[PDB]
Amino acid sequence: DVFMKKLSKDK
């Protein structure tokens, strides 16, 4: 998963 994906995952 991309950074933008992880960004949503971290939320």
Report on the architecture of this protein:
73% of the residues lie in helices and 0% in strands. With 11 residues, it is mainly α.
**Percent in helix:** over 70%
Provide the gyration radius in Å: 5 Å
Strand residues, percent: under 5%
> Please, what is the oligomeric state?
monomer
Find the count of extended strands (DSSP E, 2+ residues). Answer: 0
What is the overall number of helices?
A: 1
Q: Report the span from N to C terminus.
A: 14 Å
Largest sheet: none
- Name the overall outline: elongated
Based on secondary structure, the structural category is mainly alpha
H and E order: H
PDB class: lipid binding protein
Keywords: inhibitor, lipid binding protein, lactamised
Assembly: monomeric
Entry title: Solution NMR Structure of Lactamised Alpha-Synuclein 2-12 Peptide in 50% TFE.
Question: Any descriptors?
Answer:
11 residues; mainly alpha; 1 helix; elongated
Short description:
By secondary structure, the protein is an all-alpha fold.
What's the topology here?
Elements: H1 3-10
PDB class: lipid binding protein
Keywords: inhibitor, lipid binding protein, lactamised
Assembly: monomeric
